[PDB]
């Protein structure tokens, strides 16, 4: 009827199966084991072999390599590793069932119900919607029934990421500053009714004296929308929140300080800041976590025009500081100077802001880890441990006065959007944001390296990657528990 | 000189084609009352058949203002003047033939032509010098847009030349 | 006769002096205190005021701001801070005595004998030698006599850095692969007689099957010299060593994969890898530390010629692995594939290699910290704590399979010198070096961001910075104790 993804590990006496696999073997009377011998070598991690007709009801039994049984927290790679194995191995498996055009598939728990699910789902995602030529929409349910609460945690966690991936991925002619808000609000409210949304317009942002976010929007004729998310998880409402901020340039052309045509079509994902953290709240509300969280994301676009932000321009952020706007492409810095200032109104506990800010971050670490600066070692620890679990790494980066210094000397004004020199890119830019933050637990997460995937993460197909959404989710789970 | 330095230096979002004129006029009149100013608008420049200055302005949505300074220093009014002209692009982004992001924030001082000579008259009127001088400076901005000046374009200057 | 650098801090009731300062005040009968009032505001950190004729024997008494008395380990800035204050404050002071053309100066201990010395000396250094127009050569002795062992630790530590600064700084027509070795050997032997040097020539390197270092040298007509340093600190000779490796391209023009004329004259400091670690041993031997250390540094040059290394070239490193040489400017990677392989011969405990490898590192952190990758958290800790003390920061960077993967797929060969993509620069390059390392305590230190100083570090004048030499020294002190 449908396919099945089985798992196996490496040697002992004969490479052991995952118990779903062992079970299914006994069932076809050893002949899965038997054909595995006959087929070729053994399956190291992530490798895949497909055995037809072993079962009546399962034409295609794909067996995938799970690596070491006891594979675990790796001191170097900074993650759990079995999980990492399982994720690529059922991803590998599920993409084989999807190429066999099998619309539904059943999947080995593989000892970590959650991981096989985040594999099956992250693994299968595309963003098919605008091609009439699409792959089969395969349905992936668990195999078994003993462990359902964590496989659904898989499908949950993986989906909230897939959310961001479709929110980033979609062309910025479709996924606008409004349509992004429309979907989010819709996603947050279908997540829980303990939620309020505020797709605040130009008038309110004007009213908020958000000079800097506004200076940015004015290039396009597409409207600014400052978005406000709320989830009231806490039993006592009055618990002060955790506030997520996120940059939402739906399209970045650089503005007057205009980009090269070389791969500028990826700037449709310069709203990844906004998308990631939004998907995290949509997800923390599906988990319905005992915490009040607040999504804040200035959605607008960077374009050149007769009224676009010019080089040399001093503008006023909400907080009273002026900014020389020396480079119109350093604009997340300005959109974020204001929603950061607004974050403090909420009396937060943690202000995690996130953004696709600098290509320099990409030059830095580049899709390994999502670089995170933070005046909180406590906070750093927290994001990092969560990243160990989820596998979407995070690497601390420096928030040193050294860097502030460069941004702070300024011809016209109080702060400059680009620092004195070429060097230290993400640090300069994070140094600019701290000028707009007085809280003891702030975290900049520059996501410009994890904006995309090709092959680097196995279980993600090519296209917007939606990172580090699950590490953000997992952090708020653990902070709630 | 310091006048020109603040007139050049200030961001072209603040120091516009109008705000430049506002300050100058203010500075020229506080220099002497033997002065007239004319912050002539698009209609007058249109009227003047200043096709070429106009072709330039049309990129921005910020208004052109052709400025006219006067100082009547001469005892006999009818002494013909000394005339200063000065370019006043408050911001130059190159337009469609667009600049590099490398230090384009200095183009806020592409109105230095206009600023220098204007400061000179403001100054010659404080000195109250026995000469009639005339400040003339087309203030406008260069930007790219759906109606910006394109490459290949023949436009008509006042004098008949294309 | 001579000048004097006094220190003061911020308020209490009236801003306190350092006891040298207090003492010198009583001595001119309060009139230093008195004129300080008369002069202007108070002196915040690093600021400087110069009072003539307060003393008979001290025409110029410069007083410098020391910031907070109790200023200490900063959780964010990752350093001791009083030290950092004192360093810029007497540096500030000493450069005032040197502009007053006062050939000798006496200096306030400032509560940290060592720090005021590393300030006075790092602070005063230039590399005057090739101008006939030079500043006065001011002599900086301590003020006092109570704490002499640590001020000399200052002058020691600062000098070993100044060594590297002159070794980097000097034109690569003068400071060749041989003249670098000549000075080092000379500096190591005048440091202790418990030392051997080996300025091994092409024949020996040929003999060593150091195909990769050799492929690099062959562009120039200037000779390769693989250098071998030794210091036998250990009481029992047979204690296996700590081995420092260091890249020594005296000049990098990129080779056939040739650089831009824009500031290529700084590549005269692409031997900073070799210089830093060499200065560290010269220094650990002056300290005469109970450890055997081994300096290893392939000195040669990158030039274009009729016999220069070409793009596409597979060459053989000592260890048997081949390298596609796709970019002739990624050449530290090759010079280092071989001296890394040779490091294991010595049965080391720690293999710290150091190099000015990637401009990407500069894009990364950029003169804040010297990025360090290491398969040893233990080792990381060690370099980092040392950096807390010295102030020459170090930032861990990732050594993830992710990155290896990119370098490892290779058309022709076993390893490629540049990885698959533009992104993640220093990590790709460090991933290449680990392919040439099997030891449990290896550390790559990419020094490309700290190659230079302008103003970023206060107490260093503009020019080659010589970083992170004291953190390396301080690490081997602490590892010896
Ligand atoms: Mg941008
Ligand atoms: Mg090079
Ligand atoms: Zn952007
Ligand atoms: Zn090099």
PDB file of N, CA and C and ligand atoms in Angstrom, chain C residues 247 249 252-254 259 267 270 302 327-333 356-357, ligand 2:
ATOM      1  N   UNK C 247      53.738  29.623  10.474  1.00  0.00           N
ATOM      2  CA  UNK C 247      53.957  29.782   9.057  1.00  0.00           C
ATOM      3  C   UNK C 247      54.863  30.957   8.771  1.00  0.00           C
ATOM      4  N   UNK C 249      55.824  32.563   5.532  1.00  0.00           N
ATOM      5  CA  UNK C 249      55.936  33.160   4.202  1.00  0.00           C
ATOM      6  C   UNK C 249      56.499  34.571   4.484  1.00  0.00           C
ATOM      7  N   UNK C 252      54.182  37.181   0.827  1.00  0.00           N
ATOM      8  CA  UNK C 252      53.088  36.562   0.103  1.00  0.00           C
ATOM      9  C   UNK C 252      52.510  37.467  -0.960  1.00  0.00           C
ATOM     10  N   UNK C 253      52.763  37.216  -2.231  1.00  0.00           N
ATOM     11  CA  UNK C 253      52.190  37.996  -3.312  1.00  0.00           C
ATOM     12  C   UNK C 253      50.995  37.232  -3.900  1.00  0.00           C
ATOM     13  N   UNK C 254      50.665  36.086  -3.299  1.00  0.00           N
ATOM     14  CA  UNK C 254      49.601  35.235  -3.790  1.00  0.00           C
ATOM     15  C   UNK C 254      50.145  34.196  -4.750  1.00  0.00           C
ATOM     16  N   UNK C 259      47.707  38.471  -5.788  1.00  0.00           N
ATOM     17  CA  UNK C 259      47.038  39.545  -5.091  1.00  0.00           C
ATOM     18  C   UNK C 259      46.863  40.872  -5.827  1.00  0.00           C
ATOM     19  N   UNK C 267      52.064  41.967   3.351  1.00  0.00           N
ATOM     20  CA  UNK C 267      52.274  40.529   3.338  1.00  0.00           C
ATOM     21  C   UNK C 267      53.652  40.117   3.804  1.00  0.00           C
ATOM     22  N   UNK C 270      53.266  38.016   6.676  1.00  0.00           N
ATOM     23  CA  UNK C 270      52.654  36.708   6.541  1.00  0.00           C
ATOM     24  C   UNK C 270      53.608  35.634   7.123  1.00  0.00           C
ATOM     25  N   UNK C 302      56.120  33.333  -1.293  1.00  0.00           N
ATOM     26  CA  UNK C 302      55.235  33.120  -2.420  1.00  0.00           C
ATOM     27  C   UNK C 302      55.342  34.161  -3.544  1.00  0.00           C
ATOM     28  N   UNK C 327      44.264  27.333  -5.482  1.00  0.00           N
ATOM     29  CA  UNK C 327      44.560  28.696  -5.245  1.00  0.00           C
ATOM     30  C   UNK C 327      45.879  28.716  -4.501  1.00  0.00           C
ATOM     31  N   UNK C 328      46.823  29.230  -5.268  1.00  0.00           N
ATOM     32  CA  UNK C 328      48.198  29.495  -4.890  1.00  0.00           C
ATOM     33  C   UNK C 328      48.343  30.496  -3.718  1.00  0.00           C
ATOM     34  N   UNK C 329      47.315  31.278  -3.364  1.00  0.00           N
ATOM     35  CA  UNK C 329      47.329  32.160  -2.198  1.00  0.00           C
ATOM     36  C   UNK C 329      46.934  31.400  -0.947  1.00  0.00           C
ATOM     37  N   UNK C 330      46.216  30.276  -1.023  1.00  0.00           N
ATOM     38  CA  UNK C 330      46.017  29.438   0.151  1.00  0.00           C
ATOM     39  C   UNK C 330      47.296  28.578   0.299  1.00  0.00           C
ATOM     40  N   UNK C 331      48.397  29.145   0.824  1.00  0.00           N
ATOM     41  CA  UNK C 331      49.696  28.491   0.845  1.00  0.00           C
ATOM     42  C   UNK C 331      50.289  28.222   2.206  1.00  0.00           C
ATOM     43  N   UNK C 332      49.737  28.911   3.182  1.00  0.00           N
ATOM     44  CA  UNK C 332      50.073  28.656   4.553  1.00  0.00           C
ATOM     45  C   UNK C 332      49.548  27.275   4.797  1.00  0.00           C
ATOM     46  N   UNK C 333      48.340  26.935   4.297  1.00  0.00           N
ATOM     47  CA  UNK C 333      47.760  25.615   4.460  1.00  0.00           C
ATOM     48  C   UNK C 333      48.813  24.541   4.070  1.00  0.00           C
ATOM     49  N   UNK C 356      49.282  33.532  10.136  1.00  0.00           N
ATOM     50  CA  UNK C 356      48.444  34.579   9.554  1.00  0.00           C
ATOM     51  C   UNK C 356      47.753  33.905   8.356  1.00  0.00           C
ATOM     52  N   UNK C 357      46.830  32.955   8.558  1.00  0.00           N
ATOM     53  CA  UNK C 357      46.246  32.200   7.458  1.00  0.00           C
ATOM     54  C   UNK C 357      45.200  32.810   6.514  1.00  0.00           C
TER      55      UNK C 357
HETATM   56 MG1  LIG D   2      48.191  33.800   0.970  1.00  0.00          MG
END
